[PDB]
Design a protein around this ligand. Sequence first.
Ligand code: 117
Ligand code: 117
Ligand code: 117
Ligand code: 117
Ligand code: 117
Ligand code: CFF
Ligand code: CA
Lengths: 146, 519
Amino acid sequence: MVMSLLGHYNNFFFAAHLLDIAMGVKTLRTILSSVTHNGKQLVMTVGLLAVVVYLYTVVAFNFFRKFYNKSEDEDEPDMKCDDMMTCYLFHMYVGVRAGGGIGDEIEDPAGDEYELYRVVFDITFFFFVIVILLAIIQGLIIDAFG
Amino acid sequence: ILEYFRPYLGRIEIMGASRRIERIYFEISETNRAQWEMPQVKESKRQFIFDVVNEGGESEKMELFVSFCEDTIFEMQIAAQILEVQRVKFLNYLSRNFYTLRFLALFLAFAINFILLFYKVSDSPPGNMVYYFLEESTGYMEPALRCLSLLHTLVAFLCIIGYNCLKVPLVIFKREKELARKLEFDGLYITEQPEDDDVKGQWDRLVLNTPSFPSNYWDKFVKRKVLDKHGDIYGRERIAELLGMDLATLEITSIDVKYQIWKFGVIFTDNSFLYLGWYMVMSLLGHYNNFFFAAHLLDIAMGVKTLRTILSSVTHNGKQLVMTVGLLAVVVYLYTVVAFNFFRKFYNKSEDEDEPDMKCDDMMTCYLFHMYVGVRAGGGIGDEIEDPAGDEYELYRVVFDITFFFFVIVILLAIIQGLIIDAFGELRDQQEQVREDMETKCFICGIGSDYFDTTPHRFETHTLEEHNLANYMFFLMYLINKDETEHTGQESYVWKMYQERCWDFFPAGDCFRKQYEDQ
Ligand SMILES: CC(C)c1c(C(=O)Nc2ccccc2)c(-c2ccccc2)c(-c2ccc(F)cc2)n1CC[C@@H](O)C[C@@H](O)CC(=O)O
Ligand SMILES: CC(C)c1c(C(=O)Nc2ccccc2)c(-c2ccccc2)c(-c2ccc(F)cc2)n1CC[C@@H](O)C[C@@H](O)CC(=O)O
Ligand SMILES: CC(C)c1c(C(=O)Nc2ccccc2)c(-c2ccccc2)c(-c2ccc(F)cc2)n1CC[C@@H](O)C[C@@H](O)CC(=O)O
Ligand SMILES: CC(C)c1c(C(=O)Nc2ccccc2)c(-c2ccccc2)c(-c2ccc(F)cc2)n1CC[C@@H](O)C[C@@H](O)CC(=O)O
Ligand SMILES: CC(C)c1c(C(=O)Nc2ccccc2)c(-c2ccccc2)c(-c2ccc(F)cc2)n1CC[C@@H](O)C[C@@H](O)CC(=O)O
Ligand SMILES: Cn1c(=O)c2c(ncn2C)n(C)c1=O
Ligand SMILES: [Ca+2]
């Protein structure tokens, strides 16, 4: 009733009532419950992921600041890791969804003194974050549904 | 009278020589019941519940339990122990709150990193690179960092001191017990010999000559009885020389540095002591550079069972994983060889003319390019090099790209991921099965909760009155305290079979109710 009444002040509120179709049948209810079936393990896993990304951010901020220039125009640089908070947000927001790791969103380390360290950094990030943890997070929900 | 004496009545069931189940009643002392409730024995009980079914076999399950019953007793005894008076009180207070100190250390470590998350860098000095803070409340965080770091270091030192004062005697006790038991029952230094790869026995060999060898173990006549047992078929004089005992003494009418050396050697190989030392070293290094404190965050990784299972899933199947990655490297090397021999012209990564950047003019550069860029591409190496349209070698390039995509991306990576995922699933299944079996059957006689519960709350009564686990430990201590001449027939029977390390008196698939079901 409250949502229906609020619908008169702004029409789009009526869209909320569409959620009534979500619980209308057994299959959709099962799909919705599959998420909350294993909540505790999911929360702990995402916390572990956050901790690992924080460690990677610490290392990157200490050693690899020069490779985080996102500006294509000279005389107007856009540093992403001159602060710990900005670097951490960049790692959690762009790196996780990259699909290939953080290595395909920063500068090419070819010809640099720190080339091998950068290669190991990229490979280890790709292996630990993308391949393993995301797969476990997805598999928990899929197995619960099954 | 029954209501008053209920807490002091201990009841157990044993398996008699007459091939029947018997019930035994005895007295439980007040001091024993009071000591049974200390937190450290609760932690020991939890750890025993953890490891007894995780790796232990069904055939030895009783034996481990008996060993546990011994260790706890020793712990309780040392628990009775709690300007020199001030020092003793300080040490006792430190020993009493070890886990609280650990909690405080973890809390401080967690608090440090939140403040660390506010760092900033600049080229000019604050209003070579310069690191500083950007907190809005000026001066709020800069001294708090120093205070928290000092507190963290102090707490780490106190934790090390407490662990030294609390858990070392138990380790020494277990080491001495194992050595004495093995030496008496198997004569590993008499008939057999330790293996060359077993550094354990090689280091333990030093302590046999020590005059004060059984310092913590209760049995201070092990040397006498081992001499009596093994002195017949073997020379008595050399046996006495091996144990370093005076053969001229018989029952009738100042630092001992070797023992200290052995004790320090056995102490400095304990995992917990080394972990605490590493914790202290990292905390100390934190003062030279703040970010080192971040390492302490790893303590949260092992704090709970689920994260430990996640971590162990990686190392569960290490050998196959290593061999698979080696095979992947070999295949990529073959592809690199072919590419270097035939397809050099397609590896130009320079978008500006008159400044080319060849990637496969060397074998090493091409190999690194293939392993670094090609594997993570998602679509194979074909989407990172030049378009082969219109070239003489077009079909060969197409086959190259397709075969690389099929063999490297689709198959090998999927197998590598699936190994770890399957290991994690198997570990979870094993843990769930273990928990269910523990929660659905009686620990001692191994009879399911379906035979019971035919009457209300039958399983709970069976586990709380007839099969209670602490009653056996109370019975063992009661037998220890009592005099030998006052033992009854059943008590002497159990004592005799205990001294022979035979565990046939425990019920095995039988109970009082089942034997007398027909009354
Ligand atoms: C009869 C059923 C399939 C149905 C329709 C429908 O037929 N739409 C239909 C429409 C036109 C043509 C053909 C079909 C709509 C339905 C759905 C959309 C629009 C109109 C009716 C609903 C229904 C579900 C939740 C609501 F709040 C209201 C109605 N419901 C009722 C579901 C309810 O019975 C489930 C319950 O018995 C068991 C359970 O709780 O798990
Ligand atoms: C909030 C809760 C789920 C949680 C988190 C967390 O921060 N999740 C979360 C994740 C991301 C964002 C926000 C929140 C972490 C938690 C998990 C991972 C990383 C950091 C904290 C812990 C926790 C785990 C181990 C510890 F030693 C202490 C607490 N806990 C408590 C777990 C505890 O109940 C486990 C239980 O097994 C104890 C028992 O058996 O009695
Ligand atoms: C709980 C966890 C953080 C912990 C403690 C601790 O301080 N416990 C705690 C308990 C209550 C309150 C506060 C803290 C100690 C721990 C460390 C030193 C002394 C006592 C306990 C360790 C640990 C770490 C590395 C080691 F080599 C050995 C143990 N660990 C992690 C590893 C642990 O799993 C090893 C072993 O026990 C097997 C297992 O549990 O599955
Ligand atoms: C009690 C437990 C969940 C806990 C907390 C907590 O409650 N944090 C909490 C904090 C605030 C609010 C709510 C909850 C923290 C805990 C975690 C983070 C911060 C403070 C305390 C820890 C703990 C784990 C490892 C340490 F080194 C020290 C403490 N522990 C102890 C874990 C230990 O008992 C596990 C052991 O019994 C079995 C095993 O080894 O598998
Ligand atoms: C180091 C070890 C795991 C290894 C590697 C390797 O280089 N891995 C590695 C991977 C990548 C980088 C670095 C290291 C390869 C290995 C695997 C693949 C490619 C190259 C070497 C082998 C090995 C395999 C077959 C052989 F004929 C001889 C040795 N081995 C020894 C395997 C051997 O124990 C198998 C066992 O079954 C034998 C037995 O049953 O007694
Ligand atoms: C202290 N103590 C024990 O702890 C013990 C024992 N016999 C067995 N145990 C376990 N004896 C004789 C003993 O004195
Ligand atoms: Ca008598």
